[PDB]
Design an enzyme around this catalytic site. Sequence first.
Site, PDB file in Angstrom:
ATOM      1  N   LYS A   1       0.817  -1.205   0.000  1.00  0.00           N
ATOM      2  CA  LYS A   1       0.000   0.000   0.000  1.00  0.00           C
ATOM      3  C   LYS A   1       0.857   1.264   0.000  1.00  0.00           C
ATOM      4  CE  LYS A   1      -3.961   2.159   2.275  1.00  0.00           C
ATOM      5  NZ  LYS A   1      -3.379   3.502   1.973  1.00  0.00           N
TER       6      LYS A   1
ATOM      7  N   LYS B   1      -6.680  -7.362  -1.075  1.00  0.00           N
ATOM      8  CA  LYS B   1      -6.635  -8.491  -2.000  1.00  0.00           C
ATOM      9  C   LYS B   1      -5.279  -9.181  -1.937  1.00  0.00           C
ATOM     10  CE  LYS B   1     -10.192  -7.161  -5.337  1.00  0.00           C
ATOM     11  NZ  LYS B   1     -10.833  -6.064  -4.549  1.00  0.00           N
TER      12      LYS B   1
HETATM   13 NA    NA Z   1      -0.587   3.622  -2.168  1.00  0.00          NA
END
Ligand code: NA
Length: 326
Positions: A51, A63
């Site tokens: 992320k 996911k």
């Molecule tokens: Na990001």
Amino acid sequence: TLNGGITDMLTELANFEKNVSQAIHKYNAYRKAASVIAKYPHKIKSGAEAKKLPGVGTKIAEKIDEFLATGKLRKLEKIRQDDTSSSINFLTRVSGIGPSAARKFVDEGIKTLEDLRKNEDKLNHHQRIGLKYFGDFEKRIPREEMLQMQDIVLNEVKKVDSEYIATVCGSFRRGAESSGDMDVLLTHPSFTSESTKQPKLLHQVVEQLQKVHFITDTLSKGETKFMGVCQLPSKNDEKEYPHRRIDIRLIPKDQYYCGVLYFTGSDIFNKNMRAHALEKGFTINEYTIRPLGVTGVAGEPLPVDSEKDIFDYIQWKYREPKDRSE
DNA sequence: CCGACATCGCATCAGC
DNA sequence: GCTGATGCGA
DNA sequence: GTCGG
Ligand code: NA
Ligand SMILES: Cc1cn([C@H]2C[C@H](O)[C@@H](COP(=O)(O)NP(=O)(O)OP(=O)(O)O)O2)c(=O)[nH]c1=O
Ligand SMILES: [Mg+2]
Ligand SMILES: [Mg+2]
Ligand code: NA
């Protein structure tokens, strides 16, 4: 690639959103995420780690957590079992059959390769050729064959007019050891941004390539862009080479650098570079780079004397074609 | 949060 | 025929 | 789906 499992998953989701959901921005989102992960030089341990990368938000992070834990994605597992999705995803693999046409065919009960082969009269010309070479077009082209193809294209072009310059771009120019097709940038001094002093510049080249039986089929053809089919010649008793997709793009001679930047790609690289341009107050297409005025509307084309000049305008360090494979 | 997200040639079609 | 929108692939 | 303003 250390994260092949993840990037494959994201690509299959991207293809789903494009072909089935008809959500091109979700397609672009997944493909941007797949791209930023593909070049990440560590084996990803978690969704949180992923992320941190630009383009990976909360949904994809989750996911990745599912995938790392189980090796699968339930969302994809279900998509794979859906009949309409499976049908559409297959049909769209035929060149000329897009998301809309695919749904229309399924509605009409046309949903398999065999269905297509018995309903050829319901296909337009492009689709018809895409069906004919369905098998061939999913085969990759070894760089060795790309070199033979380049050799033929450049020499046949020279025979028409020695002042033509043909440049092979796409994944080939980025140094790829295999390509999905052949992309050709074409210039001629008669055709500039100021005038077209000779007609049929692209036509005469296509004709010559048809004459020597290199170009075998035409998907589409206008004054500046040709999209078609070609094939290497084989020798006695040899199995024939697969038919290959070829694109030829005639670009104004004085706009070669913008042209070659565009046709070299990759497509994700172009998207990201053009996005960055907009942030820096410019807009880039295959012809020009222009400032965005106080308006928000593009101004006059800026001076460009190399690919690097374009990078300089948007304050990017120069990147060789081999480093544009995003 | 919140929709803006790069950009375009050719084929095709609807409307006039 | 011309114009503008849409689909498609790049 | 993501992310900057
Ligand atoms: Na990001
Ligand atoms: C698909 C696509 C391509 N392009 C440009 C960049 C590509 O490198 C170039 C050629 O398109 P391609 O043949 O679809 N992609 P490629 O040549 O980089 O890779 P491949 O080996 O043919 O698959 O056209 C875009 O600028 N936007 C796009 O959406
Ligand atoms: Mg290519
Ligand atoms: Mg191509
Ligand atoms: Na298709």
